[PDB]
Amino acid sequence: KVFGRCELAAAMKRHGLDNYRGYSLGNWVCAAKFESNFNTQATNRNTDGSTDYGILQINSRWWCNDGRTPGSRNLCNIPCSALLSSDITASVNCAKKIVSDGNGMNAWVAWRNRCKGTDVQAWIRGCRL
Ligand SMILES: [Pt+4]
Numbered sequence: 425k426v427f428g429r430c431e432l433a434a435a436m437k438r439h440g441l442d443n444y445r446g447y448s449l450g451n452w453v454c455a456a457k458f459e460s461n462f463n464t465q466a467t468n469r470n471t472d473g474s475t476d477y478g479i480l481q482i483n484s485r486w487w488c489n490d491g492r493t494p495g496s497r498n499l500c501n502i503p504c505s506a507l508l509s510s511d512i513t514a515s516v517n518c519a520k521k522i523v524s525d526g527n528g529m530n531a532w533v534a535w536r537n538r539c540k541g542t543d544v545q546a547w548i549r550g551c552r553l
């Protein structure tokens with residue numbers, strides 16, 4: 425499913441991401457925009473053989489099992505395919521574990537490069553939240 429910007433802001437807010445570990449909603453919407461262009465079905469292969477999955481491009485080296493990343497850790501305890509669902513619950517629950525890991529939202533390279541230190545409130549502007 426391809427989310428609309430305000431639709432995704434509302435689903436993220438409902439799932440408890442607004443201000444989770446200090447990151448306002450706009451940060452999460454911005455990361456999703458640049459990680460996956462709001463498409464829950466986005467996949468991208470990394471040079472190391474791992475793959476990134478879903479709206480927040482969560483990586484199979486650490487976070488999920490895809491059966492093809494030798495020595496992967498599966499920290500979210502989830503098949504990576506679960507991250508591609510139109511229901512963002514699994515992605516959100518896994519993201520919460522990731523952002524708690526010590527490096528906050530810097531774990532998402534597009535957030536670091538394209539969202540960090542920008543006016544992220546613009547991403548929720550005009551939305552009925
Ligand atoms: Pt569809």
Ligand SMILES: [Pt+4]
Pocket residue numbers: 434435438
């Ligand atoms: Pt909803």
